[PDB]
Amino acid sequence: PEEEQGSSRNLDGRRLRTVTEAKALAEYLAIKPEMEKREKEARRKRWQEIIEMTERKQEEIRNG
C-alpha cells in the first residue's frame, strides 16, 4: 500500500519514496562487497571448470 502512495510525505517532511530508497540503498551498501566477492570467486570457479575441461581433453588426446 505504500508502493502506490509512495510520493506522499511524513510528519517531519520526508517522502515515503525517499525513505524506501534510503532503506534499500542502505541494504545494498551492506550487501554489495560480499556480492562482489561471491561473483569474483564465481567467475574464478568457472575459470577452473574451464581449465579442468581442457586438461581433460588434452589428457584424452595424449592417452588416445
Partner: peptide
C-alpha cells in the same frame, strides 16, 4: 518494373492485412 508493380498491385492479397527482472535495490 512498371509492369511488375502493376502485377503486384493486381495480385495484392486482401487476406493478409488486418488492422485494429532484477531487484529494486539495484535500480
Amino acid at each position: 518494373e512498371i509492369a511488375r508493380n502493376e502485377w503486384q498491385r493486381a495480385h495484392f492479397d486482401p487476406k493478409k492485412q488486418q488492422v485494429g527482472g532484477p531487484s529494486a535495490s539495484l535500480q
